[PDB]
RNA sequence: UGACGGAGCCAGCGAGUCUAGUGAAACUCCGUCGUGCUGGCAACGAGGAAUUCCUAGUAAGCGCAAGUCAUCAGCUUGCGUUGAUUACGUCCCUGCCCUUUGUACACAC
């Protein structure tokens, strides 16, 4: 009795940004990312655990906290997840130095590491990155706090290991038709999972094992895909 | 979702300017900046030794 | 029964005055269209802060309300809406433009929902203003919030602010203008539909206060 | 000694000072005016925009303020200050030449706000005594003798170097530190009425174009 | 000047600094402060009663202060003067607030 | 959730409250004799009504 | 005293005293199908071949009041209620009519 | 020879002189009628001295206003002030004092800035 | 419609692409005192 | 050629230490000049 | 005793009515030990009379024969 | 909050035989369009971290004049027009200051 749509040819999904605070989506926030740049005399680099013996110790910090590889391999996982292709996700990151970066769904993050390093240098110093086709602007540093950009109806949870463990599928179908889900995952190597106490009302976890960062991201994304039938 | 490739220069340097692919407009911008700083320094120095 | 005669000749003037203008000497309506009687504030604690008991002809009372503390609690709430509408760098000072788009949005509020638009905007204020909020109890900067209550002047202030800036961002680059987005916002806020920026923001503030109560 | 239009309330009463900018000031002039209002005490700043100078003067001299400091700029860099003493008193208007301000340089902390000590160096002429009186009756009378901020108006050939210092007195001398704006101001005009008119009689104004101009000081 | 009506002694005398003659006064309800206005000075003189000192000189009338009265409940000062102006001074507690009614 | 209304009878002074937050003493309207100490955010004065989502909670200081 | 004629991709209101087009509505994307006035004669609904009911106010073609996005099929008939004022009935090539509160 | 009355209405730099005398009932601002006073959204700011007290007070008198200076909204505020206090002064001088202070009570209950401007400002805090 | 009160119209729009309207239409004060 | 007036003095290290040890001497011996209460 | 006289009327105004009721219990116990009643009579009188004078409206609406 | 195209209107400054006055703009009304950037493979669609200032004719918008022995024209100072939001409480944080016999005469503390 119910008719078809008038057009069966599949449109691309509408790519969502911070200029659409209405649509239900999944925000993933990579917190405490290690994205800092530094001078060599002549050259700029992104601070690794491996490009130096003691540039980090000359800057004062310890070398174990200069890990951009793990926010790289989280960003790859989130932007190759099917929910990003279906257009129900956008990726915000926030550096441990307090710099918020909005990551478009339409971006193609480069697959090797030092290509991503050379991308992050120009992002951190030019505050904006255009496409090669130069029609839109698809990786940009925006203004803190993140709650100015998150949707107006959005439950904000954070991910940890010591928390009441839930299942992502029934947890996401608990929330209602216009509520989004903002999942603060920590992109540290180690640290207390308190990076977003001031934004978050629910601190949850996914396993009973010490869960890696991109594995936690992929677990929450696959649960969201099953909950939204993707 | 469509997937665009990001445009960025390799071995980026903020202190150096961007590599324009024209050697007769990057050159005029370079030498405009050069005449501005040398003219400013020159007439600053001649008015302060006049003082 | 009993009847008073108090005019004794049909009043006619040498300058011709329009019939609706000389009809306006029996009741003061806003823009000569929208009556101020039977406009109640359907939520107590906000009566004596949303003022609808001195009727006006236009939202341009040039009176001085910013030289004592609660004196802006008796500026008429149409004019408080107008003054809050004329704010950003682009539209500062332009009170006549703000009055004109308030006139347009009350006309289209009435033509969509066929009821009194002053009653609609008063219901929107009393549904939008949040009844609880969180301050940041410091401890030097320990990121913990403590739920406080919130006074009715702050509720009317934040109600007008949420409504007007919701109309701005809803008109930011869509086909609709500020008058039509503000009309949609005031209608949805009046009935309380949770499709408005304003009462979604109220529900978030009240829910966060319920959370870290 | 205290002259004929300051002698009624020389040390009886504290002053009351308004500090205000020229018209639609730049941000560095607003920072500069905040620095001047917390250079000298019982001074407050007033946002001049769309203020007429006659009714500004009338509102000040019926509210009871003693004097007014109006600041003029040039693209951030402040260039003039006019001091108008209100009970039909004098206006000394100055130009400012080498201005370095702490809001420009360094977050070195906060200032001290004590009733300061005052140093006046070689104001030898009667015009020097006049400008000393007009510059120091905008300060609070009778500080404590252990007040630890001093300011200095030192004449250096008609260019009053103006600085502010804090000090402790150590075992072998005294150790000084520089707070607040340094200037060299120079008086280009005195006149005997307030700022409203410019029909007032001039007590002194510098003659730039006479041929014996650069032969003497306080000419 | 103030008069004890128990020991019948003038225990307090308040003068200004300007040698003016006072034409009206007003006291606090909680009698910490006396207040007085003249017809040749345009100021209002505010004295503490506990100590004897001149606590303030309120300025802002442009005509001789004809009358003074303290509100008996909320303790706000109302002065009114021959410049066609009544004026309301919030003296107590950090305000220093002035409201002129023409 | 049933809500309740409470009129301010006394703005409490010299409490050591955090700035922008003022303690206040409100009595109810359904039984206008019993009070409770709340602490509000915006500007408040006497005999104005404010809305309590709960009344089972006395207010401490904030600091 | 006025009537709206729905041609392809425009709706023209003619006057009943001059019989010329007083006003015209041309900002439709596909063929506009139905165009009727409300019972108060204050606003004008037009169903369009893209299933976008757009209701303007009559005698002002520049203020589109609201654009109901009905079915993806062409909407072929749109008329307000004749008793009620705030409900609009649109049937389309979706074999289902809809009552919309405006 | 005629009973006439002149008043003044001022806002920021606009100023309006209103002559009220006995007549047929015509209210004219700058020669043109009162129903032409632009910006046309504040025409009811100009009208409210008439609609607050009824047109039967204006049925026997003719007012003329000459408005110079100022801007649009300062001129409509000068016009309404001049009209209001001119009606009050006419009913004082040539009609009875009871209608005089009834008019003063009605205008003062609406806003006393129809009758007394806010004139000398600022405050030096 | 039923209350037209003026120039009354019958309009018919054709499939040919044109519109057909057929309407039915509808000394001195001294001397006067004398 | 000739000029109108002596131009504005460029502040040097020697003149800033000149008025600096001047005010060192001055605030050492406390021979400064303020107002006095009446 | 150790609170001061300038902030005593604020210290007694801050506390709610449950603390007023247990303050009345404290006064009721302390005037059985007649040693420290008589050494603090004007302090007990001042505090107790300000407390019930400030909280008089609620106190006379409490219904309990114990109080 | 646009772009075209017409129309209505409202100021206050300023008068050396000297220069090489009438009038403002924002605003108001009436027709028309219709909202995905730039080149001979560069920038850019309201500007990050931080930081500064600000309480009524105030912030901000808008134009018009002058050019006053210093300063200014790579601009400066006037003048009007339009005109708000939020504090107007508090020492909780950051600081700065004051006092620690009550003295000054009662009463009270």
Curated annotation (Swiss-Prot), chain B:
Paired cysteines (S-S): none
Compartment(s) of residence: Nucleus, Nucleolus
Source superkingdom: Eukaryota
Similarity remark: Belongs to the NOP14 family.
Function: Involved in nucleolar processing of pre-18S ribosomal RNA. Has a role in the nuclear export of 40S pre-ribosomal subunit to the cytoplasm.
UniProt subunit comment: Interacts with snoRNA U3. Interacts with EMG1, MPP10 and NOC4. Component of the ribosomal small subunit (SSU) processome composed of at least 40 protein subunits and snoRNA U3.
The protein's name in its UniProt record: Nucleolar complex protein 14
Organism: Saccharomyces cerevisiae (strain ATCC 204508 / S288c) (Baker's yeast)
Residues of the full protein shown: 710 to 760 of 810
UniProtKB/Swiss-Prot annotation, chain C:
A Gene Ontology BP annotation from the UniProt entry: ribosomal small subunit assembly
GO cellular component, one term: cytosol
A single MF term (Gene Ontology): rRNA binding
Keywords per UniProt: Acetylation, Cytoplasm, Isopeptide bond, Phosphoprotein, Ribonucleoprotein, Ribosomal protein, Ubl conjugation
Localization annotation: Cytoplasm
Subunit structure: Component of the small ribosomal subunit (SSU). Mature yeast ribosomes consist of a small (40S) and a large (60S) subunit. The 40S small subunit contains 1 molecule of ribosomal RNA (18S rRNA) and 33 different proteins (encoded by 57 genes). The large 60S subunit contains 3 rRNA molecules (25S, 5.8S and 5S rRNA) and 46 different proteins (encoded by 81 genes).
PANTHER family given in the database record: RIBOSOMAL PROTEIN S7
Protein name: Small ribosomal subunit protein uS7
Curated annotation (Swiss-Prot), chain D:
Brix domain: residues covered: 15-196
Keyword flag rRNA processing: yes
Keywords, ordered alphabetically: Nucleus, Ribonucleoprotein, Ribosome biogenesis, rRNA processing
A single BP term in Gene Ontology: ribosomal small subunit biogenesis
GO cellular component: 90S preribosome; Mpp10 complex; nucleolus; nucleoplasm; small-subunit processome
Effect of residue 149 to A: Loss of RNA binding
Gene Ontology terms for molecular function: RNA folding chaperone; rRNA primary transcript binding; single-stranded telomeric DNA binding; snoRNA binding
Main subcellular localisation: nucleus
Localization in the cell: Nucleus, Nucleolus
Quaternary context: Component of a heterotrimeric complex containing IMP3, IMP4 and MPP10. Interacts with MPP10. Component of the ribosomal small subunit (SSU) processome composed of at least 40 protein subunits and snoRNA U3.
Protein task: Required for the early cleavages at sites A0, A1 and A2 during 18S ribosomal pre-RNA processing.
Name used for this protein in its record: U3 small nucleolar ribonucleoprotein protein IMP4
Record organism: Saccharomyces cerevisiae (strain ATCC 204508 / S288c)
Gene transcribed to yield this protein: IMP4
Span within the parent record: 72 to 290 of 290
UniProtKB/Swiss-Prot annotation, chain I:
Record text on subunit structure and interactions: Interacts with snoRNA U3. Interacts with MPP10. Component of the ribosomal small subunit (SSU) processome composed of at least 40 protein subunits and snoRNA U3. In the absence of snoRNA3, forms a complex with other t-UTPs. This complex can associate with pre-18S ribosomal RNAs.
Top-level taxon of the source organism: Eukaryota
Function: Involved in nucleolar processing of pre-18S ribosomal RNA. Required for optimal pre-ribosomal RNA transcription by RNA polymerase I together with a subset of U3 proteins required for transcription (t-UTPs).
Name used for this protein in its record: U3 small nucleolar RNA-associated protein 15
Location(s) in or outside the cell: Nucleus, Nucleolus
Note: Present with 358 molecules/cell in log phase SD medium.
Organism: Saccharomyces cerevisiae (strain ATCC 204508 / S288c)
